[PDB]
Design a protein around this ligand. Structure first.
Ligand SMILES: Cc1cc(N2CC[C@@](CO)(C3CC3)C2=O)cc(C(=O)NCc2cc(F)cc(-c3cnn(C)c3)c2)n1
Ligand SMILES: Cc1cc(N2CC[C@@](CO)(C3CC3)C2=O)cc(C(=O)NCc2cc(F)cc(-c3cnn(C)c3)c2)n1
Ligand code: PRO
Ligand code: PRO
Ligand SMILES: O=S([O-])[O-]
Ligand SMILES: O=S([O-])[O-]
Ligand SMILES: [Cl-]
Ligand SMILES: [Cl-]
Ligand SMILES: [Cl-]
Ligand SMILES: [Cl-]
Ligand SMILES: [Cl-]
Ligand SMILES: [Cl-]
Ligand SMILES: [Cl-]
Ligand SMILES: [Cl-]
Ligand SMILES: [Cl-]
Ligand SMILES: [Cl-]
Ligand SMILES: [Cl-]
Ligand SMILES: [Cl-]
Ligand SMILES: [Cl-]
Ligand SMILES: [Cl-]
Ligand SMILES: [Cl-]
Ligand SMILES: [Cl-]
Ligand SMILES: [Cl-]
Ligand SMILES: [Cl-]
Ligand SMILES: [Cl-]
Ligand SMILES: [Cl-]
Ligand SMILES: [Cl-]
Ligand SMILES: [Cl-]
Ligand code: NA
Ligand code: NA
Lengths: 482, 482
């Protein structure tokens, strides 16, 4: 049973919800967590979705080593260094991948010779290690995390860019379609883009309870920069060697954290039906003074009937726990639909169904069960999305000048402001908002750009930048961030 | 095009077959290889097979960290040690997992409380690192390898043992059913079993060209030994705490290497149809003086028709390569069936189909194509298995005394001998066969137990051990090994 309230101590609530639902286990090496099956099933589901999608684009899976030489890694210049095999020292220390550009792109340079070798599209599912000495957050910021990283190479910048955008659309569907989390597509500022890339696009999500934006996933136009560092060139049909144009793109188990925080409530997790490993839990009522065999046999029949409609069903027929215990047990784990069946329902040929998001209950004839539940699941999914979408739009203030920033941040909101996109102005804004935040804390940090949204509201003609007074260039989404 | 002959220089042949088919790429850190998509597709296929199978047994996937503390790892006492994060030294060095017993079993000890928590069945797909200073072999012996490792805990030894055996049967199907490689189920000797386990079972495969057995996969009865080291105990319904009985079991991309060596020929790879990512390659003949649009449209029709029968088809319609080039290109990559379509076939409403294993050609009406190809693929699969099975049984000599050992080993054969199973005798046999091998080499190493087969031939009553003269206990399979 969860006891911390989501709107009071968000940290403790989140810890309780992910521990008591058996999603996370702690580990003696700080910054790493055990991902138990209840969470891993959701990861498997979104991984299957995305893997199918990119296979339709011709992307193929592969596996590159987890180690990279100091030489290949410093060819492009929080990295963990292997230095010893038990007793023996290594002749040269090797790094564990924080990302695989420097591991893969030498191979790319060998494999790409002609324009007929392009496009080259590879992906891998693995973990990477980014070893920060700061305190971790389960799912959101961990020292090891599972991800996928795709890396493509094209004959033209425009083809590479169209791919960047197609992948960003897949990430939007990953979050919005599967996880029911609303996100904002945008471009990262020059100061925040991937090191060595040309243009970094992102989908951004929002955590209302602490007011923070989080980078949900990233799709980079690398252009020819990595091609120059690794000499990845192809021949046209005329014989002139030309640099390939590259992309890389990544998304991680951070997505699970974002789903939990988005949909959970004071009773615990709420899993969108499209990724719940158990969509319907069947709880028979098991009075001592009843035909228990009949009740359980009807539960098995209903399970078969629902699974023919591709509904994922579990029966909890344990005699040693009361139905109230089971109600709370599966609410904590976030199963979206609970189906109750006792002697009265049997005599009436109906079932009682309770939805996890609102607690609304329905009485459904057995004949109508599968089509009704299907409808109900799509209604839960959509409702989880729309409410989250509402909380997103309520969390964003459109402003015009800088003294509107601090009030908006004290309301745990993001700000959408006309910006000149000068990089020096961004670092000045970060340091001033941090100092203003510290001074406020004394009476009881920093705001950064999150993204330059693709969906730009109207820009009146003479509009000026909210911090420098110079001509505004575009609306930019700022806030505190993970 | 492959140029080394499989029966002459096996090493060079194997290197050519896996490089020229685009399965492997080399890497600047010795002992690690890049797994390119042509190989990774096969890994994905066998992973899907095994994952589905163990999900039917109630095993669930998870993910534990790749790091383990020195303390937890030396709790049970080729390990790579992380000692630094860039500049900063680690307070205590951490190891990269060579296996995950010491990572997972503390969590098990926390999670298991009551008999109602058992059985606990977890699996993970990841890589591990076993850092030997010896020279690697692609797929077979690498310093990093992808695998799966499953770890279960049960209330009784007999339940754990039945699980060990069920998994070993899945490994037999992994090799024999999917990869068409024949294997021998057996028990490992006391000297060769998993450190700290009670009984190690294995499936063993055989490489005729060098005479070597290889441990294809492993399923361990751990018993209560790890339960004692990690204090994993459960309460019965009476309240007495009792040690759980455990298993662990593993299988790796070594399986791909074994498939390559088993089925390949002088032209390159031969991929069993059940794991070929391309089962049928359609090669249109494209004379300049023909209706090319018609020919290609019929190839697309045939592709659609075959894929409705769940056949995996690729069309190679590249105009810049001759059909002879394409024939060799897809033979090298081991596609099992090639389908040729030109103007004459079109006018006759037939197609020409050539099978990769024997080169036999067929003329098939379009209407019969899908059922005929299905039949053909099952005939290739079975034939690849049966011939490999024949080469296995020809590679094993049943012997009765020790001076039959060296002749049998010089024929690149394994030996099946009555053994007393004394462990000291095994190490004596290893050292004597090694010395005999070295002395023979001078005129131009060691034989170990491979397994004690489940399928025991008859044991005449007074039979004596082939090395010590004492009463034989069981027939044991010995040979040189990887
Ligand atoms: C799960 C995850 C995802 C991503 N990222 C980054 C890339 C991206 C973005 O979309 C996606 C792959 C492309 C993503 O998901 C980055 C990290 C991460 O930086 N981990 C290290 C770490 C450990 C730690 F204990 C503490 C902190 C820490 C504490 N305070 N601060 C400011 C940091 C950081 N972790
Ligand atoms: C792919 C793979 C599989 C397995 N194993 C072991 C377990 C098993 C068996 O079934 C399965 C998981 C349970 C399996 O597949 C073990 C290795 C391995 O020992 N790697 C290290 C290494 C690297 C290296 F460069 C050279 C050598 C080397 C050279 N000479 N010698 C005598 C060794 C060894 N590698
Ligand atoms: O780490 C990143 O952000 C990029 C995208 C995935 C691979 N490298
Ligand atoms: O390494 C091994 O042999 C066992 C089985 C997989 C996990 N540990
Ligand atoms: O465990 S998988 O996602 O690499
Ligand atoms: O790449 S997967 O097999 O962990
Ligand atoms: Cl938090
Ligand atoms: Cl999987
Ligand atoms: Cl652009
Ligand atoms: Cl949507
Ligand atoms: Cl970034
Ligand atoms: Cl249950
Ligand atoms: Cl209760
Ligand atoms: Cl009821
Ligand atoms: Cl509720
Ligand atoms: Cl755009
Ligand atoms: Cl917006
Ligand atoms: Cl070899
Ligand atoms: Cl996959
Ligand atoms: Cl036994
Ligand atoms: Cl078989
Ligand atoms: Cl072993
Ligand atoms: Cl092709
Ligand atoms: Cl040729
Ligand atoms: Cl022909
Ligand atoms: Cl042939
Ligand atoms: Cl047995
Ligand atoms: Cl045998
Ligand atoms: Na303006
Ligand atoms: Na005997």
């Amino acid at each position: 049973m969860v006891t911390a309230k989501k709107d009071e101590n968000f940290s403790e609530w989140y810890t309780q919800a992910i521990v008591r639902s058996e999603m996370i286990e702690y580990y003696d090496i700080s910054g790493c967590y055990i991902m138990r099956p209840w969470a891993f099933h959701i990861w498997e589901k979104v991984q299957r979705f995305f893997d199918d999608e990119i296979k339709k684009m011709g992307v193929e899976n592969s596996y590159f080593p987890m180690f990279v030489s100091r030489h290949k890694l410093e060819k492009e210049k929080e990295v963990a260094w292997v230095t010893h095999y038990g007793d023996s020292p290594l002749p040269e220390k090797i790094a564990i991948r924080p990302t695989s550009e420097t591991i893969m792109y030498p191979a790319y340079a060998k494999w790409i010779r002609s324009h007929r070798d392009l496009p080259l599209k590879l992906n891998q599912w693995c973990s990477v290690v980014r070893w920060e000495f700061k305190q971790p957050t389960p799912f959101l910021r961990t020292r090891e995390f599972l991800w996928q990283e795709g890396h493509t190479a094209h004959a033209t910048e425009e083809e590479a860019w169209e791919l960047v955008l197609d992948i960003l659309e897949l990430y939007r569907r990953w979050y919005e379609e599967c996880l029911a989390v609303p996100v904002i597509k945008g471009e990262k500022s020059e100061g925040e883009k991937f090191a060595g890339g040309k243009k970094t696009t992102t989908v951004e999500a929002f955590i209302p309870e602490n007011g923070r934006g989080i980078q949900a996933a990233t799709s980079h136009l690398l252009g020819t920069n990595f091609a120059k560092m690794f000499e990845i060139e192809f021949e046209d049909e005329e014989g002139h060697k030309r640099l390939v144009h590259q992309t890389s793109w990544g998304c991680t188990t951070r997505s699970l954290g974002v789903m939990i925080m988005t949909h959970g409530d004071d009773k615990g997790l709420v899993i969108p039906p499209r990724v719940a490993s158990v969509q319907v839990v069947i709880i028979p009522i098991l009075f001592k003074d009843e035909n228990t065999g009949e009740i359980l046999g009807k539960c098995r029949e209903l399970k078969t009937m629902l699974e023919k409609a591709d509904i994922r069903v579990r029966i909890d027929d344990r005699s040693n726990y009361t139905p109230g215990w089971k109600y709370n047990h599966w609410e904590v784990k976030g199963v979206p639909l609970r189906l109750e069946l006792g002697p009265k329902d049997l005599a009436k040929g109906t079932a009682r169904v309770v939805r996890r998001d609102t607690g609304e209950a329905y009485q459904i004839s057995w004949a109508d069960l599968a089509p009704k539940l299907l409808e109900l699941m799509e209604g839960i999914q959509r409702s989880l999305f729309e409410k989250a979408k509402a909380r997103l739009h309520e969390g964003i203030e459109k402003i015009s000048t800088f003294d509107e920033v601090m009030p908006a941040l004290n309301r745990k909101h993001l700000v959408l402001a006309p910006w000149c996109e000068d990089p020096e102005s961004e670092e000045q804004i970060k340091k001033e908002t941090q100092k203003l935040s510290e001074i406020q804390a004394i009476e009881a940090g920093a705001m950064k750009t999150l993204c330059i949204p693709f969906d730009q509201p109207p820009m009146p003609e003479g509009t000026k930048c909210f911090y420098t007074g110079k001509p505004a260039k575009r609306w930019t989404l700022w806030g505190r961030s993970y």
